[PDB]
Symmetry: C3
Subunit: 114 residues, 3 copies
């Protein structure tokens, strides 16, 4: 799995330990070993949400399975929770796109997961 957050929150407002926290919480949530979890935070972005430049985030979570109705609500509560606590972003200013990838469409270590 792999989680990306793009935000207008400045770099200095991202707490040390954030990428580790996301890695551990995502490992717990998805039931996958942390060794497979990739996380990426992109601060200082030029963005707007509803026409406002108040803190916001545009995120993605890609997984091979483990994507679906109830699971995605649970991930949203988790990830919005983290972004609110750690980056002070309102949950109503967060979008998270969820992608259920086919194993043949994820490359890794010179091959794919197929």
């Amino acid at each position: 799995p792999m989680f990306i957050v793009n935000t207008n929150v400045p770099r200095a407002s991202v707490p040390d330990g954030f990428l580790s926290e996301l890695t551990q919480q995502l490992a717990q949530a998805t039931g996958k070993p942390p060794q497979y979890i990739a996380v990426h935070v992109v601060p200082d972005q030029l963005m707007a949400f509803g026409g406002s430049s108040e803190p916001c985030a545009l995120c993605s979570l890609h997984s091979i399975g483990k994507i679906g109705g109830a699971q995605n609500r649970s991930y949203s509560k988790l990830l919005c929770g983290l972004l609110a606590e750690r980056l002070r972003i309102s949950p109503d200013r967060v979008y998270i796109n969820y992608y259920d990838m086919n194993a043949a469409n994820v490359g890794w270590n010179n091959s794919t997961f197929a």
Copy 2:
């Protein structure tokens, strides 16, 4: 709906009001209220299009519906038009990937749109 543009155009060449113009024009084009629209511009990128580093843009539009043949042609004319006028990017050096997201696969405000 949500629109992202990555470009090699420098930040100083992004005019004031650009995010807001995107927001307003996307609201007009998609019909959706502006308060839902997210926009994101990433200048100063290291990119090439057809092997050349002349101004170019790689973009995405995600929407829950309101994606299809004619709609996407209309969006492309709109967006290419804005990029040409405001960032001086030739339309033939713009790619826009369109994504029709399932509501269950879009997180927002501690829950999804399903």
Copy 3:
């Protein structure tokens, strides 16, 4: 086709000539290089398996030319380039492949449909 690589490798470690990717993608996909778009994003705040050693998160979008065997080939190619040029271990690279419908790719005021 379009290829995007996001990496914590610093900008100074991306060698001259790298945006090589265009040529090699043209060759791999059997498409003219005029169609190929490439984007490299260095200096990123990222981890892979909880480590901040060099890593990359990438995407390849194509209108067709995506599938089992093809994607393995693309991955050997691309991981090879990332290892040689950016000193990223192949097991610290993910590449998401997307088979786009022509109607869902915009270009030159219209789409490819």
